[PDB]
Scaffold this motif. Structure first.
Motif, PDB file in Angstrom:
ATOM      1  N   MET B  70      21.514  15.680 -42.261  1.00 13.80           N
ATOM      2  CA  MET B  70      20.872  15.402 -40.967  1.00 13.80           C
ATOM      3  C   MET B  70      21.711  15.985 -39.839  1.00 13.80           C
ATOM      4  O   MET B  70      22.862  15.660 -39.712  1.00 13.80           O
ATOM      5  CB  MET B  70      20.667  13.904 -40.750  1.00 13.80           C
ATOM      6  CG  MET B  70      20.300  13.523 -39.334  1.00 13.80           C
ATOM      7  SD  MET B  70      20.125  11.588 -39.163  1.00 13.80           S
ATOM      8  CE  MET B  70      18.377  11.566 -39.832  1.00 13.80           C
ATOM      9  N   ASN B  71      21.108  16.841 -39.031  1.00 13.67           N
ATOM     10  CA  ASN B  71      21.795  17.524 -37.945  1.00 13.67           C
ATOM     11  C   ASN B  71      20.882  17.427 -36.728  1.00 13.67           C
ATOM     12  O   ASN B  71      19.720  17.808 -36.813  1.00 13.67           O
ATOM     13  CB  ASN B  71      22.059  18.981 -38.331  1.00 13.67           C
ATOM     14  CG  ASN B  71      22.968  19.721 -37.332  1.00 13.67           C
ATOM     15  OD1 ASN B  71      23.953  20.372 -37.707  1.00 13.67           O
ATOM     16  ND2 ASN B  71      22.613  19.669 -36.098  1.00 13.67           N
ATOM     17  N   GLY B  72      21.401  16.878 -35.616  1.00 10.45           N
ATOM     18  CA  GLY B  72      20.612  16.599 -34.429  1.00 10.45           C
ATOM     19  C   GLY B  72      21.367  16.212 -33.146  1.00 10.45           C
ATOM     20  O   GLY B  72      22.615  16.123 -33.085  1.00 10.45           O
ATOM     21  N   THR B  73      20.571  15.957 -32.103  1.00 14.16           N
ATOM     22  CA  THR B  73      21.074  15.725 -30.768  1.00 14.16           C
ATOM     23  C   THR B  73      20.445  14.454 -30.209  1.00 14.16           C
ATOM     24  O   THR B  73      19.224  14.357 -30.028  1.00 14.16           O
ATOM     25  CB  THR B  73      20.752  16.917 -29.848  1.00 14.16           C
ATOM     26  OG1 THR B  73      21.201  18.147 -30.433  1.00 14.16           O
ATOM     27  CG2 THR B  73      21.572  16.846 -28.590  1.00 14.16           C
ATOM     28  N   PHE B  74      21.302  13.472 -29.945  1.00 12.10           N
ATOM     29  CA  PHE B  74      20.891  12.304 -29.189  1.00 12.10           C
ATOM     30  C   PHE B  74      20.929  12.672 -27.719  1.00 12.10           C
ATOM     31  O   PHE B  74      21.769  13.455 -27.295  1.00 12.10           O
ATOM     32  CB  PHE B  74      21.825  11.140 -29.465  1.00 12.10           C
ATOM     33  CG  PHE B  74      21.708  10.610 -30.845  1.00 12.10           C
ATOM     34  CD1 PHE B  74      22.585  11.022 -31.831  1.00 12.10           C
ATOM     35  CD2 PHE B  74      20.681   9.699 -31.173  1.00 12.10           C
ATOM     36  CE1 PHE B  74      22.450  10.510 -33.129  1.00 12.10           C
ATOM     37  CE2 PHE B  74      20.551   9.194 -32.469  1.00 12.10           C
ATOM     38  CZ  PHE B  74      21.433   9.586 -33.433  1.00 12.10           C
ATOM     39  N   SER B  75      19.987  12.125 -26.966  1.00 17.43           N
ATOM     40  CA  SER B  75      19.889  12.380 -25.537  1.00 17.43           C
ATOM     41  C   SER B  75      19.391  11.160 -24.781  1.00 17.43           C
ATOM     42  O   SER B  75      18.426  10.535 -25.187  1.00 17.43           O
ATOM     43  CB  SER B  75      18.952  13.557 -25.294  1.00 17.43           C
ATOM     44  OG  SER B  75      18.923  13.900 -23.921  1.00 17.43           O
ATOM     45  N   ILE B  76      20.068  10.801 -23.699  1.00 16.79           N
ATOM     46  CA  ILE B  76      19.529   9.843 -22.723  1.00 16.79           C
ATOM     47  C   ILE B  76      19.816  10.312 -21.292  1.00 16.79           C
ATOM     48  O   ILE B  76      20.700  11.137 -21.063  1.00 16.79           O
ATOM     49  CB  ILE B  76      20.048   8.395 -22.988  1.00 16.79           C
ATOM     50  CG1 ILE B  76      19.217   7.369 -22.228  1.00 16.79           C
ATOM     51  CG2 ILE B  76      21.535   8.243 -22.641  1.00 16.79           C
ATOM     52  CD1 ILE B  76      19.465   5.917 -22.665  1.00 16.79           C
ATOM     53  N   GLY B  77      19.023   9.819 -20.341  1.00 11.21           N
ATOM     54  CA  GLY B  77      19.321   9.950 -18.915  1.00 11.21           C
ATOM     55  C   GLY B  77      19.044  11.298 -18.266  1.00 11.21           C
ATOM     56  O   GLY B  77      19.545  11.581 -17.180  1.00 11.21           O
ATOM     57  N   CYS B  78      18.273  12.136 -18.958  1.00 10.07           N
ATOM     58  CA  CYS B  78      17.798  13.418 -18.451  1.00 10.07           C
ATOM     59  C   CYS B  78      17.032  13.178 -17.137  1.00 10.07           C
ATOM     60  O   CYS B  78      16.141  12.326 -17.079  1.00 10.07           O
ATOM     61  CB  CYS B  78      16.920  14.105 -19.515  1.00 10.07           C
ATOM     62  SG  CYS B  78      16.910  13.212 -21.115  1.00 10.07           S
ATOM     63  N   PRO B  79      17.434  13.879 -16.075  1.00  7.04           N
ATOM     64  CA  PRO B  79      16.805  13.761 -14.744  1.00  7.04           C
ATOM     65  C   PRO B  79      15.277  13.982 -14.707  1.00  7.04           C
ATOM     66  O   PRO B  79      14.552  13.138 -14.161  1.00  7.04           O
ATOM     67  CB  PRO B  79      17.525  14.843 -13.921  1.00  7.04           C
ATOM     68  CG  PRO B  79      18.246  15.701 -14.941  1.00  7.04           C
ATOM     69  CD  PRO B  79      18.577  14.810 -16.072  1.00  7.04           C
ATOM     70  N   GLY B  80      14.809  15.098 -15.274  1.00 10.06           N
ATOM     71  CA  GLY B  80      13.384  15.385 -15.375  1.00 10.06           C
ATOM     72  C   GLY B  80      12.763  14.844 -16.660  1.00 10.06           C
ATOM     73  O   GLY B  80      12.116  15.588 -17.415  1.00 10.06           O
ATOM     74  N   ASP B  81      12.971  13.549 -16.916  1.00 16.03           N
ATOM     75  CA  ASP B  81      12.353  12.891 -18.060  1.00 16.03           C
ATOM     76  C   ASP B  81      11.011  12.232 -17.717  1.00 16.03           C
ATOM     77  O   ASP B  81      10.929  11.306 -16.878  1.00 16.03           O
ATOM     78  CB  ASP B  81      13.298  11.891 -18.735  1.00 16.03           C
ATOM     79  CG  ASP B  81      13.087  11.817 -20.251  1.00 16.03           C
ATOM     80  OD1 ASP B  81      12.160  12.460 -20.787  1.00 16.03           O
ATOM     81  OD2 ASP B  81      13.807  11.140 -20.996  1.00 16.03           O
ATOM     82  N   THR B  82       9.979  12.744 -18.398  1.00 15.79           N
ATOM     83  CA  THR B  82       8.612  12.217 -18.399  1.00 15.79           C
ATOM     84  C   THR B  82       8.587  10.752 -18.871  1.00 15.79           C
ATOM     85  O   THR B  82       9.455  10.314 -19.646  1.00 15.79           O
ATOM     86  CB  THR B  82       7.663  13.128 -19.280  1.00 15.79           C
ATOM     87  OG1 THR B  82       7.514  12.591 -20.607  1.00 15.79           O
ATOM     88  CG2 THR B  82       8.281  14.527 -19.531  1.00 15.79           C
ATOM     89  N   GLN B  83       7.597   9.997 -18.396  1.00 14.72           N
ATOM     90  CA  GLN B  83       7.502   8.572 -18.726  1.00 14.72           C
ATOM     91  C   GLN B  83       6.729   8.284 -20.025  1.00 14.72           C
ATOM     92  O   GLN B  83       6.897   7.213 -20.629  1.00 14.72           O
ATOM     93  CB  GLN B  83       6.945   7.768 -17.538  1.00 14.72           C
ATOM     94  CG  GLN B  83       7.999   6.910 -16.786  1.00 14.72           C
ATOM     95  CD  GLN B  83       9.381   6.852 -17.474  1.00 14.72           C
ATOM     96  OE1 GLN B  83       9.757   5.819 -18.049  1.00 14.72           O
ATOM     97  NE2 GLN B  83      10.141   7.950 -17.387  1.00 14.72           N
ATOM     98  N   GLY B  84       5.905   9.248 -20.442  1.00 14.67           N
ATOM     99  CA  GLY B  84       5.154   9.161 -21.681  1.00 14.67           C
ATOM    100  C   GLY B  84       5.991   9.558 -22.881  1.00 14.67           C
ATOM    101  O   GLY B  84       7.222   9.655 -22.783  1.00 14.67           O
ATOM    102  N   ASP B  85       5.326   9.785 -24.013  1.00 11.10           N
ATOM    103  CA  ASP B  85       5.995  10.171 -25.254  1.00 11.10           C
ATOM    104  C   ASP B  85       7.098   9.194 -25.681  1.00 11.10           C
ATOM    105  O   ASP B  85       8.205   9.621 -26.026  1.00 11.10           O
ATOM    106  CB  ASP B  85       6.564  11.587 -25.131  1.00 11.10           C
ATOM    107  CG  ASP B  85       5.498  12.617 -24.888  1.00 11.10           C
ATOM    108  OD1 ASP B  85       4.299  12.274 -24.980  1.00 11.10           O
ATOM    109  OD2 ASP B  85       5.759  13.799 -24.607  1.00 11.10           O
TER     110      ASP B  85
END
Ligand SMILES: Cc1ncc(C[n+]2csc(CCO)c2C)c(N)n1
Ligand SMILES: Cc1ncc(C[n+]2csc(CCO)c2C)c(N)n1
Ligand SMILES: Cc1ncc(C[n+]2csc(CCO)c2C)c(N)n1
Ligand SMILES: Cc1ncc(C[n+]2csc(CCO)c2C)c(N)n1
Ligand SMILES: [Ca+2]
Lengths: 182, 182
Positions: B70-85
């Motif tokens: 398993m190889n991946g990227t956790f992400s939080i707090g992105c400025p231009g983050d959409t509210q859906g999905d």
């Protein structure tokens, strides 16, 4: 200003050990400092040499005909960072050996400009280059999609990398490249 | 603030499609929004839900008894983050009580737009130390080792800390199960 690439090759086949081993050995790696471990390999050196070896390793792996992925992180300018786990001093030694090799490089990548108030614009710039080059497919959550031959995609990735580091001291860029998928 | 994990599974086997399919379907994915494409899958929801689902995917894939990454990227707090999905309790903890796997790991934490980011990266190595998962530091990453429970416990711990002190963080991970070098 040593460039780095920590990456993994993933051959989707029982024959995985040999594909990894063989992609690495097939590449001219004399111009980068390398260290392979159980999870990943790291290349260190100049941007030219790092990117040159990266493309090469990718094209050797792809030309095994197995479904292979290259997944890794390009890095430059991390504060601190030893002056010497490197090969020092200009030629793209792999160029010749791999101009008869071709490959599809559908790709998802992410640019992370560190300690950088204008990183959003830098990433926005990164997208523009990809669009300008004709390799850009779409944006998805947390990454951008590219498609094209290895040469065009690797061109796009380097131009993005070069652009951004010209602007910011410390940048990372993750790439996830897929070859020989159905 | 919505957590995301964009990741891939790499089964080093001929039976890989079936391995990827199985791991995603075996998991309880009802507390995260998901989207799978030819390259990666993205999970989006709360931090507990993203890490809970990620761990359960890792466990299921490992228990194919095949060498899987398993190889991946956790992400939080992105400025231009959409509210859906997104999906609006660790729902997998029960289901996986019975599962075990080794989870040797190279991770790297990228606090975005953060002057003290190296301090946060210092902190993160210390958490891994505090939890007994730290093995060593390598160029561009840190190495953990342990069972999935402790390794994934560490990552989320690292991720939570960073996310408390700064706004946009990314964390990459590369986790290896059932390697024949072991
Ligand atoms: C670029 C690259 N470096 C190392 C590994 C990890 N790895 C996995 S199996 C193996 C042994 C092959 O002899 C090694 C070194 C990788 N996947 N990709
Ligand atoms: C090549 C490229 N494509 C997309 C992202 C994704 N992304 C991550 S954070 C962010 C918002 C900037 O403030 C965006 C668009 C990226 N990092 N790099
Ligand atoms: C987590 C996860 N999502 C997508 C892929 C990409 N991928 C590769 S082959 C394939 C078809 C299997 O149905 C898919 C979706 C992956 N490797 N890992
Ligand atoms: C979890 C975590 N461990 C190590 C690194 C690696 N690393 C990258 S730059 C740097 C020096 C501080 O800027 C260090 C230690 C990381 N990024 N994330
Ligand atoms: Ca399910």
């Amino acid at each position: 200003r040593i460039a780095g690439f920590r990456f993994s090759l993933y051959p989707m086949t029982d024959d995985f050990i040999s594909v990894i081993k063989s992609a690495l050995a097939a590449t001219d790696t004399s111009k980068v400092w390398t260290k392979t471990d159980h999870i990943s390999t790291v290349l260190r050196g100049s941007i030219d040499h790092v990117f040159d070896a990266a493309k090469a390793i990718y094209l050797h792996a792809a030309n095994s005909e197995q479904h292979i992925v290259m997944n890794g992180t390009f890095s430059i300018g991390c504060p601190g960072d030893t002056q010497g786990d490197t090969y020092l001093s200009d030629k793209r030694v792999n160029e010749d050996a791999v101009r008869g090799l071709k490959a599809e490089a559908p790709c998802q990548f992410a640019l992370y400009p560190m300690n950088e108030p204008d990183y959003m614009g830098l990433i926005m710039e990164a997208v523009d280059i990809a669009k300008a080059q004709g390799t850009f497919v779409q944006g998805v959550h947390y990454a951008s999609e590219l498609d094209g031959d290895a040469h065009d995609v690797f061109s796009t990735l380097e131009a993005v990398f070069r652009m951004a580091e010209q602007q910011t001291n410390h940048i990372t860029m993750t790439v996830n490249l897929s070859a020989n998928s159905p």
